[model samples]
Target: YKFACPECPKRFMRSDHLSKHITLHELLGEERR
Candidate 1:
C-alpha cells in the first residue's frame, strides 16, 4: 500500500508494518504538527 506524507506530501510503499512505523516518523517527530 501507499501512504502520502502530511508534511512533505511524499508517497511510499512497504511490504510490512516496518514501513508504517517509518511513515509515522513524521507524525511522531512532530513534523506534521
Candidate 2:
C-alpha cells in the first residue's frame, strides 16, 4: 500500500508513517523562520 502527501510529492507505505513525516515537514518549515 502507498500513501501520498497532499502537500508535496513525497509518498509513504503506511498512513502513520506519512502522518509523522508530515509533522516533520511542518516542523522544518517552522524552523526555517
Candidate 3:
C-alpha cells in the first residue's frame, strides 16, 4: 500500500519517489496543454 500515478498503476513504498514522478508528469501535462 503506497502511492501511484497515471504513469503506472504499480505503487511505490517511497513517498518521495512518487512525488518526483508525479511532479514530472504534472510539468509534462502543463507544458503539453
Candidate 4:
C-alpha cells in the first residue's frame, strides 16, 4: 500500500518510509527543495 505525506500529500510505499519523509520534512520545515 502507498502512504501519503501529511505535510505535503506526497505518496510513498510504506509507513516507515512515510515517517522518514515526514521526519525530513519536519527537519527541513517543509522546504523540500
Put down candidate 2 lDDT per residue, 1-33, tens digits, no spaces.
599766656666898866877777756632223
Candidate 1 lDDT (Cα, 0 to 1): 0.51
Model 1, span 1-33: residue lDDT tens: 476545554455743534554566556643433
Top lDDT prediction, candidate number? 4
Residue 24 shift from truth in candidate 4, angstroms? 1.6
TM-score per candidate, in order? 0.32, 0.56, 0.41, 0.57
Q: How high a TM-score does candidate 2 get?
A: 0.56
Candidate 3's TM-score:
0.41
How many residue pairs clash in all the candidates, one count each? Answer: 0, 0, 0, 0
RMSD list, candidates in order: 5.8, 5.2, 6.3, 2.8
Model 2 regions more than 4 Å off: 29-33
The top-ranked prediction according to TM-score is 4
Q: For each candidate, what is the lDDT? A: 0.51, 0.66, 0.62, 0.73
Candidate 2 pairs with clashing backbones: none
**Candidate 3 segments whose C-alpha is farther than 4 A from its true place:** 6-8, 27-33
Alpha-carbon deviation at 4 in model 2, angstroms: 0.7
Which ten contiguous residues of candidate 3 have the minimum total lDDT?
24-33
